From Swiss-Prot, chain A:
Residues 23-42 bind DNA. It comes from the Archaea. The keyword Transcription applies. The keyword Membrane does not apply. Coiled coil: none annotated. It comes from Pyrococcus horikoshii (strain ATCC 700860 / DSM 12428 / JCM 9974 / NBRC 100139 / OT-3). Gene3D superfamilies: 3.30.70.920, Winged helix-like DNA-binding domain superfamily/Winged helix DNA-binding domain. Pfam families: HTH_24 (PF13412). This is Uncharacterized HTH-type transcriptional regulator PH0061. Keywords: DNA-binding, Transcription, Transcription regulation. Residues 4-65 form the HTH asnC-type domain. GO terms for molecular function: sequence-specific DNA binding. PANTHER family: HTH-TYPE TRANSCRIPTIONAL REGULATOR PTR2 (PTHR43413:SF7), TRANSCRIPTIONAL REGULATOR, ASNC FAMILY (PTHR43413).
Length: 148, 146
């Protein structure tokens, strides 16, 4: 739930900046062997510590825009159902449960086109039932974006 | 607009960014030389800003926090963004349109006392806001980047 080897953390920090570094390059940077780096990364993946090797794109240049959906549920049972209902939607990039004004926070990747975007938002919202409050925030600018 | 191959390339790399050019050429039915060139272009144009990973935050001993900010006047948003964008534990900053015009994601240690220290240090840099809401994330059910 927290404590993790010092070298494993460095490895995570490094891979988050350049996930394509070969085991050899990693071994050189960390003054260890390629074999040991291989085993470490393999364990990290097996343990679910590293869940995916992906990329950070400039969504605007790809023709997309983000939207953040803030949800306040009426009851827990409804929250979990909403979450299972939307977690499989492809354009839903993240789903989180929180403690505060909104208990469900969702990020959507939408088409940059306002009419297509609005149609898509309406479709998504139809899937949200039993909510006391739903706030949609259209993201006009992404200034900073990192995972860790 | 990016062409058919570039669009599909971004998609593939979003699923597995460690694919060898060989594996990519095979999928996209082309040559490693062409793959190398396309990716080089995508990176140079800034379409692909980074090759990263999605780790399990909880397993590393951290927790997220989303801060919702509503400026009193539009021009204030840029000021706040300039003031917080450099903070190490600020993971994302976005300008938005709606009930809140600034959304920030923070990476914090799970220890509530240590997390509070970081949150307070961060909130200190947000001057004269109309509304500020801090939401601690108890669980990440899904996390992807496109």
């Amino acid at each position: 739930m927290r404590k993790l080897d010092r070298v494993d953390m460095q490895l995570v920090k490094i891979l988050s900046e350049n996930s394509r570094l070969t085991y050899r390059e990693l071994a050189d940077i960390l003054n260890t062997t390629r074999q040991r780096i291989a085993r470490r990364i393999d364990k990290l993946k097996k343990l679910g510590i590293i869940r995916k090797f992906t990329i950070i794109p400039d969504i605007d240049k790809l023709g997309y825009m983000y939207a953040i959906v803030l949800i306040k549920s009426k009851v827990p049972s409804d929250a979990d159902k909403v979450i299972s209902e939307i977690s499989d939607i492809e354009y839903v990039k993240s789903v989180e449960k929180g403690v505060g004004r909104y208990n469900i926070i969702v990020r959507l990747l939408l088409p940059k086109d306002i009419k297509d975007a609005e149609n898509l938002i309406s479709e998504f919202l139809q899937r949200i039932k039993n909510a006391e409050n739903v706030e949609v925030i259209l993201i006009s600018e992404v200034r900073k974006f990192e995972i860790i």
